[PDB]
């Protein structure tokens, strides 16, 4: 009763070496678990360039060409899921 993403990530063109963000703000009951996937695979933390900040913001520094793709916010709850994705083009 039950997860809504109120702000999700936004489609972007980003420059190589730059820094960009994936934001996700979710409500629900109970509090939803948030996870991020890129082209269907769960995003790394082992990558020093990719950091979890506060207020829903996942931040990616030193953009590479291979960061291009689809990034999905999945908000979960034993009773439901929501998803909100964006396409990031690094060039």
């Amino acid at each position, epitope marked *: 009763m039950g997860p809504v993403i109120r702000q999700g990530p936004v489609n972007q063109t*980003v420059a190589v070496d*730059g*820094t960009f963000v994936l*934001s996700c703000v979710a409500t629900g009951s109970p509090v939803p678990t948030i996870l991020w996937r890129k082209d269907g695979v769960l995003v790394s933390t082992q990558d020093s360039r990719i950091k*979890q*900040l*506060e*207020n829903g913001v996942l931040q990616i*520094r030193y953009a590479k060409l291979g960061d291009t793709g689809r990034y999905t916010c999945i908000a979960s709850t034993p009773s439901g899921e929501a998803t909100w994705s964006a396409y990031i083009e690094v060039q």
Partner: antibody
Amino acid sequence: EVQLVESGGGVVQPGGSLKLSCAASGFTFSTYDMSWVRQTPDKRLELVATINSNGGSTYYPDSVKGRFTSSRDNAKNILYLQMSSLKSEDTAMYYCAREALLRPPYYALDYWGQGTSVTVSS
Amino acid sequence: DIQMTQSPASLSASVGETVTITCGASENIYGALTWYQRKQGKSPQLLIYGAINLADDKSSRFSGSGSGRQYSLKISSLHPDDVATYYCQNVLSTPFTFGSGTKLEIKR
């Protein structure tokens, strides 16, 4: 104590080239990302170069991309900024700064040098 | 590019006053903001990061607030040594643009 010492500033002709240095000491330099920030005469500030601990990753904003290149020597503990095709807008004070490690890991600069002045002129 | 606009350009208050400096972003930056203090003859120092986290090594007189596009640095119980130029910086996405500064002066 952390010490960051800029040198290499001075006058340079429009279209000319300069290399700045930053002699770092009192912290484990090879282990920290490093930035160069400049302060123009109106007192505005602008980040113009970041470089990671190992030197493998570098960033430059649009204003100086192509024209500015950063490097570091992790044995001697010196940071560099090579500048070229200089113009009046690059006329500024140039600071070398250490990137903090924070929790959460926001980007921030926790120690800065005193600066070296670059004047673009004939 | 995100445009930071800072306010006021300059400001003065008396010892013991509480003062507020503001930073407006051109879009939501989700607390991904930092504040710096620069004293005459010194290098800048970090005061606040992430909009609200005071740096390990500064005074609890400093406090940072806000969300969305609008942010505040509060300096309670002003001291003479607070005299400085204050800067905000966007650190959400590049270019990491700074605010243009607030010079704080003391009335005596």
